[PDB]
RNA sequence: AUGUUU
RNA sequence: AGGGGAUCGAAGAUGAUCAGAUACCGUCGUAGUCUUAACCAUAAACUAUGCCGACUAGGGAUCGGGUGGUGUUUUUUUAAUGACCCACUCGGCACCUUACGAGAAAUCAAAGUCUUUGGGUUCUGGGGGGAGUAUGGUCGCAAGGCUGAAACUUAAAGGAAUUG
């Protein structure tokens, strides 16, 4: 055989084995554990408003250069502090 | 580092952690 | 050493391939013919070619040599027949007009042929 | 001119053999691309890709160029050539030659009923090269060639208009994917069907029919 | 990958083979893996067979041989050239020279 | 379908038995040879010379079917068969390959080689494996002089014969040439012994 | 393979092996077609008249073409006692 | 090969084959009539007898068991029933 | 241990055909095996087959004619409805014009064509093409 | 094969195709049945009864001569054992191994073999209880194994 | 016998 | 925990190398090595290949059993076992060649009979780390075993093979 039961009455074993092995999938495990709610400062949401706390220049990882002008933000929703990149040429002067 | 010595160092760390948790209560 | 390179050996073989009814096994009358039937651009190389051709055609009279066919191997092969002729085709002789076979060969012949002179021990 | 070698090629240039289907029927090995050129004049060629292959030797980068070519007429015949040469141009030309030499017939068939001019394959087929498995499934009319661009190009040069494709393995290895698709194409005329069950009288080879084509007077 | 079709040893159907000690360095090797060479040298080769036969009080003495089975580990056998590195195809050849 | 004239006669039967064609290989014999008559002690197997003769006749008919005699290639790298194939290609219009085969002789259409035959005959499939492989590369049928321990791969007509003996090899080649000539018409009547004796095909070492 | 109204729409109805009945493909360069000359009135090997056998590259590679040709010949004639069904 | 009569294998090959691997399985054992040193019966003895069979009306040992075929006491006549 | 004598028989037939043999012996040669062979022989994928009666379950010698590409069992013997016969044929057969999905129905063992023209269904047994 | 081993042995009897008595067999079915009952009263199990019948007499199979198996003959004549013979011999082997084990106590090989033997005993006893050859409450216990083989 | 690093 | 403790020898002590050398090397030497009575339950515990069943090449060796032979040698008195030889056979450790076939390849008679995908069945894996970590449970005298995450991080890590 193929290492899995083939018998006509093997449905319970087949589906239980699938249930056990689905936990090795990133997406399935994350969704069933509810990582986005407990972890993931955005509580499983697309966007989140927050209050800037500090301008910061983080030096881009090697082999690059040109520190990237992010902002520390404190989320109104839950209160966590996240670093958010400010994408454009300039565009830091428009955030205070 | 060698996997054997990584395991040994980790076991020593585990022993120290058990001892600290024992002294605490 | 005194080993001849490919531009000597191959040119000599090419000369002997088409000029066997030509220059003999003597170097003096070999190089002269080379002069008129080969565009050798140096007398030293001509001397090499003619000496190796002389050697090739001197040893040609002791047996055919590899990679050389001047349309005489076929002739000499078909000429040299029957080194042991008119004595025995290995038929009805070399015995008391019988075949000295074993029992199993005897049964083999008994399978189809009732006529075979046998001395099956 | 041509000045043929390959007495098969001699017969082709003499006009004794006038269809490549005879060569295919007698499984005659073709050694000159001119045989294919004269038997399939309407044979177009598509270069699939040129990629540099590199050999490291004493500062390395021998950097030869390898070209994949598919030749074919969109009626029954494709061939696939893969050739590496020092320059892209010469590799392409030699690959076209190799593909013409490798030209084989494909067996087109019907998905459903017998409405004329077969549009699809006669059976399911599979080819494998390396890790790449390409499976061709007969498709109804109007389905088109359901395949990735390279295999779809090879199939329309084969003359298939309706086919489903399935693939497994590292299909981003273009050479192996094309070779697997070419094997799948070729196996169609190797799959025995009930309509081919009937026994035929085993015709005589053209090489025997015209035997006075190996000589130099 | 797997370098040798069976292994660098001779053990199929056994599981465990008791070890031996290398004559040169004392490394423990399974007896089937150790490189074993027999030595049947003459007790007196010594450039001096004739001298010993002259000094001998017995005519036709038939001087004896010294017998010794040597067991080498892989490292010691390779280093002392009892055994040598062979090509990938030459390794698949078990006849002695 | 072949007449009693094509049946095996006592004359060539005792010719085979004298040449020791029937002395097959030892107990080691390829398990694809039903040409074996009962095995005598000392291991030597007896080859059924009736089957040998029938296969020789079938091979001769295959050779005669070939329209151009030059399209038939006789091959022997073993010395014991080189004179055999040379005399065979003299008597029939065949093309001989004696000695080295120069791998690439059936593919690789470059000069000094590249004959394109319709049939290949080999003295020993083992020693002529290269020619057999190339024939399998270019669709060439193969007849072979096969001992009971000779490989059968890509060998379409196996003539069972001892190939350890120069007498056997030469005699088998001689009978093959005889039957080819008889079928062609060179020998008008298959009742005369073909005056050319079966020693011109044998090997001569000195 | 014919279409509706029954005209042959497939090119190159292929040959089949005389031994194993498998199709001789266009690239099977190990396959072999053997012609055995016909014999009329004490020999003379009528030219162009043969008994034809097609052996597949598979059989030839397996080294069974000799036995298969023995069987097929003997079934057509051309051989009286070489091949036996029982073994 | 590739063509053989599986339904009619030769007697030689069938006798070569293991008893379970013939076309139809069957025993290669048999029964013998051993001449008793006395009378009133010719004793029937299995060829592969596991028992040290003695005469029905006496106490002489006719066969001694072995791994395969039994022995025959070194004086006896034995028909092969 | 042996769980499908039909699977063993069809596997032996497949191996013999793909090795080019013209005959194959199969043991223990049950009734389902014989019916499956009868279907295959009716459609001409095998030749004659002869049952050898040992007083065990028996044997069969089948004559192959080189027209068999593959015969196989579907294990387990899935329950198949009339509308699932088409899915099984699509999955197993090389084309829609030839080959057979063989079923066991209470109208007997039969290929899918005569199954659907008797309007019967059952459990899937195997396939042949 | 070899339920409790890696052995793949196939050695067994190959009983003939002929389902009738051999032509050279002239003893009555009643006479062989009487011999069977005599051996059973002498205390032989059906297996050794068959062995004696085949070795010392010409009865190839009691089932082909008398048309009945030896155990069935013994049961019809009231000479059947209280437990089947194979189960009895398995329990006897278990008792022997267990006695050796309580005398050695370091023979871990014997401990393992005893586990195997008792596994076989329990499987065979489950079969016999299923087919109602043994009472539904029949139980094999280590300390009464001797008590039930004697 | 010893001979580190890039 | 008793007994035993020759040898070798985690620790430890020393000699020497060395830039350092609390390493390799030398000399000792405790535990241990051995045994009894109990624990422990882990190994590259490996064939890194679950088990049961069937089929698909060829070959010669070899172990155990069996069968046969005009067999050789061996003696007891016919004959006999024994050893050997030959052939066959069942079972086993393997091996050689070729691969229809398989595989990414190395290679593989199974790692084949797989996109022409289903004989039965158990266990395991789902990119690399974090991590066999934390925590809880359980077993253990302990060492530890079994079970076993997450946060976070990362575009490779890895396999086989090629030329340098
Ligand atoms: K950069
Ligand atoms: K001590
Ligand atoms: Mg390595
Ligand atoms: Mg171990
Ligand atoms: Mg079994
Ligand atoms: Mg079990
Ligand atoms: Mg650096
Ligand atoms: Mg573990
Ligand atoms: Mg493991
Ligand atoms: Mg992972
Ligand atoms: Mg690597
Ligand atoms: Zn060492």
XYZ file of C-alpha atoms in Angstrom, chain I residues 27-129:
103
model
C -3.207 -18.568 -8.524
C -5.705 -19.044 -6.690
C -8.093 -18.280 -9.625
C -11.405 -17.377 -7.980
C -14.852 -16.824 -9.529
C -14.456 -13.039 -9.582
C -11.124 -13.544 -11.345
C -12.807 -15.782 -13.922
C -15.637 -13.289 -14.524
C -13.195 -10.382 -14.877
C -11.185 -12.471 -17.341
C -14.370 -13.304 -19.249
C -15.081 -9.583 -19.633
C -11.501 -8.912 -20.751
C -11.678 -11.793 -23.243
C -15.085 -10.732 -24.560
C -13.559 -7.349 -25.335
C -10.467 -9.093 -26.704
C -7.729 -7.889 -24.358
C -6.748 -11.489 -23.559
C -7.014 -14.725 -25.478
C -8.099 -18.109 -24.177
C -7.648 -18.937 -20.513
C -7.714 -22.420 -19.017
C -8.620 -23.231 -15.419
C -6.382 -25.859 -13.801
C -8.342 -27.778 -11.169
C -6.186 -28.659 -8.296
C -8.393 -29.536 -5.365
C -7.277 -26.236 -3.879
C -8.753 -22.934 -5.085
C -7.294 -23.659 -8.543
C -5.079 -21.933 -11.094
C -5.569 -20.193 -14.445
C -3.307 -19.960 -17.490
C -4.225 -16.924 -19.602
C -3.103 -16.303 -23.185
C -2.117 -12.682 -23.771
C -2.332 -11.195 -27.258
C -0.380 -7.962 -26.789
C -3.485 -5.749 -26.891
C -3.540 -5.089 -23.137
C -2.070 -1.793 -21.989
C -3.146 -2.141 -18.359
C -5.616 -4.072 -16.233
C -5.978 -3.218 -12.575
C -8.251 -3.389 -9.584
C -9.802 -0.469 -7.765
C -9.356 -1.324 -4.102
C -11.443 -0.796 -2.117
C -14.506 -1.728 -4.171
C -16.052 1.720 -3.930
C -19.807 2.006 -4.183
C -20.502 3.637 -7.549
C -23.726 5.301 -8.615
C -24.913 5.618 -12.206
C -23.676 9.210 -12.267
C -20.330 8.319 -10.680
C -19.630 5.733 -13.380
C -18.733 8.675 -15.627
C -16.276 10.113 -13.097
C -14.634 6.705 -12.718
C -14.328 6.270 -16.489
C -12.894 9.778 -16.864
C -10.325 9.100 -14.142
C -9.258 5.592 -15.187
C -9.684 5.232 -18.949
C -7.203 6.667 -21.475
C -9.982 7.994 -23.720
C -13.757 8.070 -24.075
C -13.725 5.731 -27.095
C -12.179 2.564 -25.636
C -11.262 0.908 -22.373
C -13.638 -0.331 -19.721
C -14.398 0.292 -16.078
C -15.481 -3.092 -14.727
C -18.087 -3.168 -11.963
C -19.736 -5.787 -9.797
C -23.484 -5.211 -9.916
C -26.367 -7.370 -8.782
C -26.954 -7.922 -12.503
C -23.494 -9.530 -12.511
C -19.916 -8.526 -13.194
C -19.805 -6.320 -16.271
C -18.099 -3.382 -17.939
C -19.460 0.140 -17.623
C -20.958 0.234 -21.128
C -23.293 -2.706 -20.591
C -23.761 -1.480 -17.019
C -25.180 1.808 -18.290
C -27.213 0.113 -21.013
C -28.748 -2.249 -18.447
C -29.133 0.826 -16.198
C -27.465 -0.949 -13.282
C -24.722 0.048 -10.872
C -22.853 -1.512 -7.993
C -19.281 -1.511 -6.738
C -16.236 -0.755 -8.858
C -14.059 -3.803 -9.487
C -11.316 -2.748 -11.870
C -10.455 -1.496 -15.326
C -8.944 -2.715 -18.585
C -7.611 -0.928 -21.662
